[PDB]
DNA sequence: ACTGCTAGAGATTTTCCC
DNA sequence: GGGAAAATCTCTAGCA
DNA sequence: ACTGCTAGAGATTTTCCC
DNA sequence: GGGAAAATCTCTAGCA
């Protein structure tokens, strides 16, 4: 009843950025979403992005 | 303790030095002769 | 080599030579010549070669007035999606700006607006409208238009689309709304291969769904890891640190 | 991979769930689940808006209601003119995915200017929205003393209706309902584009449902098979 | 899918959608939608995202007039070294430009000058001076100031150095020549760690020495490789190809 | 045979199409209605 | 009497550029100098640069 | 590496060639060859310009001659004023590496403005250049009919003298001679900077001549050694 | 205490198709 | 494992 | 048939020093 | 083989 919701929140993609790199890093895996930070998993690397530096979408090319 | 030499509102001249109060990601808050100013980091040099 | 320091300062007071010239002419290490040129107030004339990054939260918008054919176009962008709202206003006044902003906040979930320091946006009228609608007002650094770079890029793109379909409309109002239609729904590409209209509903529906999903997750996982945010098999995220 | 397919086929013929439930429950691609729900015989509107004109204080307020969600857009217009109606309609079509508008056959709704605007934006015209009009008029009466003009009171009422009046089943506002409805319609359109892209392929003679990185899902004579393609 | 081509052209004639929108909406491959958007005259509004490269031969200079404190400064740069010649001229006329150019050609081996299309440089007076001195005149593309990017960068740097030492001089002529001194001899860094004054004599002495050395080499090696330019142990350069 | 859509002397509008006569490293020489023009390659698109 | 001159012309350094890369590639070895082209050896790679794309210096930090 | 060192030491004590010949002939670094020529006892000006004023047609032409090369710079000045002389001198010091100027002690050369300009530019003042003045005046007479003004004839004469009048030993013009002389002076200054940078190091007590990537060249008691360092 | 970006054109690299 | 197509990278104007 | 560049500031990578 | 210094890379304003 809980792992279904955890995999559902992991089905969301995050496009994030770093502090001085102006390019948009690719679609990561959303692990956790907070009010000020967003914990992602990009390239088997768990990062904590600020919320103001992330665009989270469920890509509707999931079909 | 830092010195900040900054560029200001539509002025080509560079003012300073000023006390650095806060350094952010893309802007700094400084104090040049009892004037709290917010300058971008492209228009400021911190020593 | 303090004789080199004395002659290098005495020469830099005249010629304002850089650190390479003083390090080559007076046998100085680069640290000392860099200190000599850094202690001069007249030689600090260049800033950091970087750029900041705008706030791309799902609730922040960016507003700006542009001018086309002698008329004023008030444009707002959703900076997380590129969704464009635009109107032709009869005057660049805080009354029309507050009307546009109240109408936009009634249309979409506007949490924050990021404008420049134009009188339109700095007025008391736009300040009562954002207080009533619950919008936070962020103002950029004055005469730094790059702090609102999303809305200026969208002003450029909107003027380009207006110029493409200007001969299909008899007034500029029709051409502005036709360009808003074309940008929001007839041009794709970006972070999902979407148009801006698909991308804003993806951003907002994702915000709602992830908020409700994390609210249902958080009320179940109540572990204290030596507060658990996310447990995996290789790492564990707590609060926010990633413990191995 | 075939295990989830047979579980979904049995679960659909015993329960008749749609393709979204079979794609969430059994980890299938949505083309496979839609072909499962389309193989059955028992199981054989987000773009429709409705426009009306409401008269308050002598002024005229044009009101468009999303009939699937109840989301509303209102504008105090200077006159009941086809120019103002076509301007409102081009604005609304630029803001939201408007496919059909339902009007009340007035002199301004059947104008040539509104017909030209619906031709340009691609809108089809058809000739309980009064409940939405009554709730908007009572919210305007609740909020009229907070505005100086009527044009800045109908926008306050549209804000209160779309984001501050929650109800229905899940207690969502009209804005959350319209973004969920439009997101569902975008998922439907993307699934239809995915089906139309592979509806001309034939696999050796069988259909092509899903071409994975290691597997190819075909349908030979109402039998979904997984085998590891001509157009 | 020619029905998709017909409806995509009929929709692009209204909305001017890009190739991604027509490829997503009408089931088109990217080549066909790119052909539809490339056959439209109204959609060609962007050029190549590149830059050219100026001619950095050892004999070509770049001239430009700038304005400072209401006075006209005629500046020339050696674009292979950054060596700056500059004068304050009483008027932006072809007579003063021809005098400056004849004086510069008498001072340094000027083979080519690359100016814009300013009337000063486009005149018949500067055209007789370059004919007498043997200078070739290259003119840039009009209203493309990047084609003379070396001299505009040196105008920026020269104005910065003038602003640094403006309070040491009572007239602008003295400040311009002081800045020319500081740029040519008191600021180092570049392709050799040189100043511009060291770099121009390195460029020109290298040109003379390599010309004489290749003239003495060429009159000895007279082999025909199936004309020998340079024989090595791994390759052989002929004329100009590098045969293994 | 190429089409060239170019940008001209201080004009924001884009003209064309024109015959491409010569393509260089950073500029093109084209012919738009019996007018030989030299445009930079940043201000021109060749199809 | 000739290889001395060949090594002398190989003691010169060339700073060259390519057609679309705006960065200045580092000090190569001057093999041959002509009126329109310059044959260099950069990173054991023999290139033919145009003369208008090369700055040839004898670096006087040869001491 | 020591082989070229002993060949250069024997060749210097039999022939007395300078450090440039010993650095070109035996592939030594120039610090080693200069220490070889400095160890001997038998073998124990590019910045000097000279300024004069020449009167033609009533106008005054200030003429600076590089006394090592014969390269010339002339300007028709409006008056024999210390302002005009200091302006010419600051121009000339900005164009070329001017270290010393030799004048003819006139009222304009001993002015306070020229003294301030020589103090700022770093020039020292000292109080067959008439051969250069005569050749310039005869080239002006050869070229006066090709110009309208005298100011644009002295620049034509400076062009003809500096780049179109070849002579001397190798048949070089004055421009090639001054760029070879200034390049030789820059090589001399870079060698002096390289010597001064390592003149404080001592290697264990011996000098440090050249610190290679695999070898260290020292001098212990007039004996250049190669061994594979404190300041 | 706040902050360049966006869309298109062409080149380069990666992935798919037998 | 080549060729073609798609995805990604690089870079620029123009909006202030 | 012609063409962005230059110098400085800070980050990152490579080389030297025992 | 770490630490420090030097060399190299990245990026920006401002000149048109
Ligand atoms: Ca503004
Ligand atoms: Ca100019
Ligand atoms: Ca603006
Ligand atoms: Ca200019
Ligand atoms: Zn200084
Ligand atoms: Zn069924
Ligand atoms: Zn088009
Ligand atoms: Zn001797």
Interhelix angle C149-164/C172-185, nearest 10 degrees? 110
Using a CB-CB cut-off of 8 Å, the residues of chain D touching A60 are 183, 186-187, 190
Inter-chain contact C202–D183, Cβ cutoff 8 Å? yes
The conformational region for residue C17 under phi > 0 = left, psi -120 to 50 = alpha, else beta, is beta
Cβ of F36 near strand K (distance < 7 A): yes
G33 touches chain E (CB under 8 A): yes
Cβ of A20 near strand I (distance < 7 A): no
Nucleotides of I under 7 A from a protein CB: 1-11, 16-18
CB contacts < 8 A, E to G, total 84
Using a CB-CB cut-off of 8 Å, the residues of chain E touching F5 are 41, 44-45
- Closest listed residue to residue H87, CA positions, set E159, E67, E72, E88: E88
Cα–Cα distance measured from residue E4 to residue A51, given in angstroms and rounded to the nearest whole number? 41
- Closest listed residue to residue D77, CA positions, set D94, D59, D65, D95: D59
DSSP label at E90? S
Chain D interface residues facing chain C, Cβ-Cβ under 8 Å?
A: 73, 87, 90-91, 93-97, 120-121, 146, 151-152, 155-156, 158-159, 162-163, 175-176, 179-180, 182-183, 186
Tell me how far the alpha carbon of residue C111 lies from the centroid of ligand 3, in angstroms: 22
* Structural domains in chain G (count): 1
Cα–Cα distance measured from residue H172 to residue E209, given in angstroms and rounded to the nearest whole number? 12
Could you please report the per-residue DSSP string of C103-166?
HHHHHS---EEEE-S-HHHHSHHHHHHHHHHT-EEEEPPTT-GGGGHHHHHHHHHHHHHHHHSG
CB atoms within 10 A of CB H84: 18
- Closest listed residue to residue H178, CA positions, set E79, E77, G8, E204: E204
User: Using an 8 Å Cβ cutoff, are H140 and H56 in contact?
Assistant: yes
Breaks in chain A at C–N > 2.5 Å: after which residues? none
User: Using an 8 Å Cβ cutoff, are C75 and C158 in contact?
Assistant: yes
Nucleotides of J under 7 A from a protein CB: 5-6, 8-16
* Cα dihedral D15, D21, D24, D28 sign: positive
Distance spanning both ends of chain H, measured CA to CA: 25
Using a CB-CB cut-off of 8 Å, the residues of chain B touching C51 are 26, 42
Query: Which chains does A contact via 3+ CB–CB distances below 8 A?
Result: C, D
Inter-chain contact C192–A5, Cβ cutoff 8 Å? no
Experimental structure resolution, Å: 2.9
Inter-chain contact F42–E49, Cβ cutoff 8 Å? yes
Cα–Cα distance measured from residue H31 to residue C26, given in angstroms and rounded to the nearest whole number? 19
Using a CB-CB cut-off of 8 Å, the residues of chain F touching E49 are 42
For the domain that residue G21 is a member of, what is the CATH number?
A: 2.30.30.10
D-G interface (Cβ pairs under 8 Å ≥ 3): no
- List all residues 6 or more positions away from E32 whose beta carbon is below 8 Å from its beta carbon: E4, E5, E8, E23
Which ligand minimizes its atom distance to the CA of D41?
6
| Peptide bond connecting B17 to the previous residue in cis, omega within 30 degrees of 0 | yes
Cα–Cα distance measured from residue A48 to residue A39, given in angstroms and rounded to the nearest whole number? 4
For residue G3, is it within any domain?
no
Cα–Cα distance measured from residue C84 to residue C76, given in angstroms and rounded to the nearest whole number? 6
Using a CB-CB cut-off of 8 Å, the residues of chain C touching B27 are 52, 141
Biggest alpha carbon distance in chain H?
73
Tell me how far the alpha carbon of residue E121 lies from the centroid of ligand 2, in angstroms: 9
Q: Which residue of H has its CA nearest to G11?
A: H24
Compare CB distances from E191 to G30, G48, G57 and report the shortest one's residue: G57
Nucleotides of L under 7 A from a protein CB: 5-6, 8-16
CB atoms within 10 A of CB E11: 18
**Straight-line distance from CA D139 to C1' J11, in Å?**
53
Cα–Cα distance measured from residue C91 to residue C99, given in angstroms and rounded to the nearest whole number? 12
Which ligand minimizes its atom distance to the CA of C43?
5
Inter-chain contact E161–C16, Cβ cutoff 8 Å? yes
CB burial readout D130-168, b (16+ within 10 A) else e: eebbebbbebbeebeeebeeebbbbbbbbbbbbbeeeee
The conformational region for residue D83 under phi > 0 = left, psi -120 to 50 = alpha, else beta, is alpha
Cβ of C214 near strand J (distance < 7 A): no
Q: Which residue of E has its CA nearest to G61?
A: E192
Interhelix angle E124-133/E94-107, nearest 10 degrees? 20
Number of helical (H) and strand (E) elements in chain C, helices listed first? 9, 8
Full residue range of the structural domain in which residue A19 is found:
11-58
Inter-chain contact H196–C24, Cβ cutoff 8 Å? no
Tell me how far the alpha carbon of residue E156 lies from the centroid of ligand 4, in angstroms: 9
- Closest listed residue to residue D74, CA positions, set D51, D94, D90: D51
Full residue range of the structural domain in which residue B13 is found:
1-47
Cβ of E112 near strand K (distance < 7 A): no
Strands, DSSP E only, in F1-47?
A: 3-7, 14-23, 27-31, 36-40, 44-46
Cβ of D213 near strand I (distance < 7 A): yes
E-G interface (Cβ pairs under 8 Å ≥ 3): yes
Interhelix angle D2-15/D30-39, nearest 10 degrees? 40
* Structural domains in chain B (count): 1
Q: Choosing among E14, E23, E29, E30, which should be mutated to test the D contact, i.e. which has the most D CBs within 10 A?
A: E14
For the domain that residue F39 is a member of, what is the CATH number?
A: 2.30.30.10
Chain C interface residues facing chain A, Cβ-Cβ under 8 Å?
A: 50-51, 53, 55-58, 80-81, 191-194, 198-199, 202-203, 205-207, 209-211, 213-214, 216-217, 220-221, 229-230, 232, 235, 237, 240, 242
G7 touches chain E (CB under 8 A): no
Inter-chain contact D87–C132, Cβ cutoff 8 Å? no
Angle at D51 between CA D47 and CA D55, to 5 degrees: 155
- Closest listed residue to residue D195, CA positions, set D8, D42, D31: D31
Three-state secondary structure call for residue H124? strand
E141 touches chain F (CB under 8 A): yes
C120 min Cα distance to partner chain H (Å): 53
Which residues make beta-bridge pairs with D197? none
Q: Which nucleotide is nearest to C144 (CA to C1')?
A: J16
Experimental technique, in short, is: cryo-EM
Q: Choosing among H20, H179, H185, H190, which should be mutated to test the G contact, i.e. which has the most G CBs within 10 A?
A: H190
Runs of H (alpha helix) within chain D:
2-15, 19-25, 30-39, 82-95, 112-121, 129-143, 151-163, 174-198
For residue G23, is it within any domain?
yes
Three-state secondary structure call for residue H207? strand
Which residues make beta-bridge pairs with C242? C237
User: Using an 8 Å Cβ cutoff, are C244 and A62 in contact?
Assistant: no
CA C189 from centre of chain: 20
Strands C83-89, E112-115: pairing kind: unpaired
For residue G63, is it within any domain?
no
Three-state secondary structure call for residue D219? strand
**What is the phi/psi pair of residue F33, to 5°?**
60, 60
């Amino acid at each position: 009843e809980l792992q279904k919701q955890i995999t559902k929140i992991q089905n969301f993609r995050v496009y994030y950025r770093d502090s001085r790199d102006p390019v948009w890093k690719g679609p990561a895996k959303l692990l956790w979403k907070g009010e000020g930070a967003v914990v992602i998993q990009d390239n088997s690397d768990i990062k904590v992005v600020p919320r103001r530096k992330a665009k989270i979408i469920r890509d509707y090319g999931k079909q | 303790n830092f010195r900040v030499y900054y560029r200001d509102s539509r002025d080509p001249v560079w003012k300073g030095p000023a006390k650095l109060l806060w350094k952010g990601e893309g802007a700094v808050v400084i104090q040049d002769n009892s004037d709290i100013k917010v300058v971008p980091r492209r228009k400021a040099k911190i020593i | 080599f303090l004789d080199g320091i004395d002659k290098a300062q005495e020469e830099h007071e005249k010629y304002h030579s850089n650190w390479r010239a003083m390090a080559s002419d007076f046998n100085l290490p680069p640290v000392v010549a860099k200190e000599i040129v850094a202690s001069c107030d007249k030689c600090q004339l260049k800033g950091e070669a970087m750029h900041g990054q705008v706030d791309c939260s799902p609730g922040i918008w960016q507003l700006d007035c542009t001018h086309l054919e002698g008329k004023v176009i008030l444009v707002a962008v959703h900076v997380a999606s590129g969704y464009i709202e635009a109107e032709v206003i009869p005057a660049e006044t805080g009354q029309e700006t507050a009307y546009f902003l109240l109408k936009l906040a009634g249309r979409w979930p506007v949490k924050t607006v990021h404008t420049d320091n134009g009188s339109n946006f700095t007025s008391t009228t736009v300040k009562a409208a954002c207080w009533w609608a619950g919008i936070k007002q962020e103002f950029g650094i004055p005469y730094n238009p790059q702090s609102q770079g999303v809305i200026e890029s969208m002003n450029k793109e909107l003027k380009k689309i207006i110029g493409q379909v200007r001969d299909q409309a008899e007034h500029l109002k029709t051409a502005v709304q036709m360009a808003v239609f074309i940008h929001n729904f007839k041009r794709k590409g970006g972070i999902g291969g979407y148009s801006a209209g698909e991308r804003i509903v993806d951003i907002i529906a994702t915000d709602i769904q992830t908020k409700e999903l994390q609210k249902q997750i958080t009320k179940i996982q109540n572990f204290r890891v030596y507060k658990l945010l996310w447990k995996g098999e290789g790492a564990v995220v707590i609060q926010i640190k990633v413990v191995p």
